Design a binder for this molecule. Structure first.
Ligand SMILES: CCN1Cc2cc3c(cc2NCCC1=O)OCO3
Length: 164
C-alpha cells in the first residue's frame, strides 16, 4: 500500500509536465509519510511553490528547500529534522528518489531525483521511492542545470499532491 504522489513543474513560468513518484511506505514508512504530507500540504507547509535549486546534469535534481530556497533550509512534518530510517533501498539508477542531508540523522524536506546510478550515496542517503512516470519531465529539469548546480531558468513546483 504505497502512495502515488505528483509534482507539477514549471521553468520560467511555463509547464514542463508532471512527475509521478511511488513512495516506498513498505520499506521506509516514516520517510515516505513525510514526503507524502509535504506534497499534499496538509500540515500547513510543503513543496507547493518551492524550487529545484540545485540541478546537476548526469547526477541529480535537488529540491524541497521551501524555507530558504537555497539548499540550507527545509523542515520535516515531525520537526526540523528526523533520523535516517534505514538504508535498505539503494541508489540503483535514474529515477531514484532520495533524501538530501547534511550528515547522519539530518533529514528534513530536501530531496533529490537521480538521473544516473549514484551508488556512492548508498548507506549515506535514505532512498524512499522512485519515478513511476514523467522521467522525460525530470530530463527537462536536468537540462536547465549546470555542473555547478545553478539553474539557467527558475524551476518551480507549481502544484503537488497525492494520486492514491
Ligand atoms: C542540517 C540543517 N537543517 C536544514 C537542512 C539542510 C540540508 C539538508 C537537511 C536539512 N535538515 C532540516 C533541518 C536542519 O537541521 O540536506 C541538504 O541541506
Amino acid at each position: 500500500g504505497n502512495p502515488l504522489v505528483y509534482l507539477d513543474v514549471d521553468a520560467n513560468g511555463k509547464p514542463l509536465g508532471r512527475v509521478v513518484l511511488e513512495l516506498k511506505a513498505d520499506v521506509v514508512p516514516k520517510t515516505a509519510e513525510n514526503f507524502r504530507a509535504l506534497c499534499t500540504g496538509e500540515k500547513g507547509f510543503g513543496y507547493k511553490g518551492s524550487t529545484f535549486h540545485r540541478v546537476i546534469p548526469s547526477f541529480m535534481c535537488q529540491a524541497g528547500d521551501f524555507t530558504n530556497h537555497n539548499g540550507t533550509g527545509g523542515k520535516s512534518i515531525y520537526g526540523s529534522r528526523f533520523p535516517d530510517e534505514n538504508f535498505t533501498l539503494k541508489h540503483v539508477g535514474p529515477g531514484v528518489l532520495s533524501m538530501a542531508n547534511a550528515g547522519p540523522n539530518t533529514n528534513g524536506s530536501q530531496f533529490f531525483i537521480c538521473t544516473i546510478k549514484t551508488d556512492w550515496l548508498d548507506g549515506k542517503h535514505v532512498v524512499f521511492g522512485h519515478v513511476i512516470e514523467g522521467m522525460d519531465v525530470v530530463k527537462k529539469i536536468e537540462s536547465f542545470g549546470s555542473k555547478s548546480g545553478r539553474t539557467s531558468k527558475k524551476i518551480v513546483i507549481t502544484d503537488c499532491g497525492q494520486l492514491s
